[PDB]
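#help-structures

NK: newbie question. if I give both the sequence and a SMILES, will the prediction place the ligand too? trying with GCP
OV: yes, paste both and it writes out the complex. here, I ran yours:
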Amino acid sequence: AWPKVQPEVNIGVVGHVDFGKTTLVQAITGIWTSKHSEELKRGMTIKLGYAETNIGVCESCKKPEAYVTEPSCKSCGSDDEPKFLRRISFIDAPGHEVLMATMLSGAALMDGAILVVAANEPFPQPQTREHFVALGIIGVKNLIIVQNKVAVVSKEEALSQYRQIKQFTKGTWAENVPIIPVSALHKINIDSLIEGIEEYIKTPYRDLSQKPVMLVIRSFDVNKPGTQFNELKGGVIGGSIIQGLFKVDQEIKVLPGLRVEKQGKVSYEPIFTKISSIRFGDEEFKEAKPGGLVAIGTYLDPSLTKADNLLGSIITLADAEVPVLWNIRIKYNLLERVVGAKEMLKVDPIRAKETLMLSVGSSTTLGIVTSVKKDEIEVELRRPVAVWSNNIRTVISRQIAGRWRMIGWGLVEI
Ligand SMILES: Nc1nc2c(ncn2[C@@H]2O[C@H](COP(=O)(O)OP(=O)(O)CP(=O)(O)O)[C@@H](O)[C@H]2O)c(=O)[nH]1
Ligand SMILES: [Mg+2]
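OV: that's the protein plus ligand as structure tokens.
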């Protein structure tokens, strides 16, 4: 008698490369997130992976084994069904070096986070530190550190690394962050991770008063090949809602929208449409709340949505007043040292005329610095950015050693 509702919380899974993120998400949800051919062939995550599962508890059994991801208490004794707590979803971020820009985007969609640390690898490491301080910046401080691959190391070594993690987090915003030893591959001590999720990653408060805003991270064409032009389904736009709620048959718009070429001149025109369908995985719904990753059916030509073309864009109501800016002011603060790089090196102050990478919401855009002050910089963006609210958290990256590395953050001023 478990209800078929949408996920109510987004838990991001971040960490260094090949530490077992996707295998962990599979160990919990039973689903392999990587569905693209490229990432299945290369054996990594390239685009944000998604997977969801129900969470329940057999309140007549002993925790943490009392927790289940399916409506059955046969594994603990009683034949009655467990108490449905909530449905959760995971955002599986890539742990690769040159995919940081993706992770940041995913971080805009996270309510809580899990940081995967390999027990068979030394601590700390590049993308570990980087994703850590990134989560600190974004505001995803509902964190759980997971000691994966614990089955290949002795308890002495596991505790040895544990001490190092506690030392590392000692004196930071993550000082009291829990550390849970699991084995994603062989499914060892997963129940404790479920329990930890329920304890430390609670479902946030959603103020439905705020205007409906969705951050787009994917878009595609559900039309199977050779489909005649009369049976062509509308374009589908996928992403996460950060505030408010969307309903079917609602008038919406995509910002900045569509790139337009007029004899070499480039502009951007908002994409107006109507929600034809809303789904969360295989289940279809009439509403769409924050938490989970929603597929929004539109009346758009599939040509516009094909191949994640609307990535980074946002979706609001048609009559919403939203500034789409080519130039933005940012009240910034820089990091002290470049955390992503393998070599320890400090970060130069923002130079005029310098080109930077800005992560605003789910959008990554390059821009040239036009004004430099102690607390504020002004940037001329190569492409427009939709700024739905005031004080939007942005992430500032600079190209170092040929690769874009995070150097600091800021808030978008309007
Ligand atoms: N022994 C052991 N091996 C594991 C565990 N988890 C993952 N692995 C191994 O790591 C390999 C890749 O793990 P994967 O889950 O893809 O790591 P990832 O971090 O998602 C890859 P990327 O960071 O590039 O997106 C797998 O072949 C698997 O054998 C674990 O808990 N124990
Ligand atoms: Mg992966």
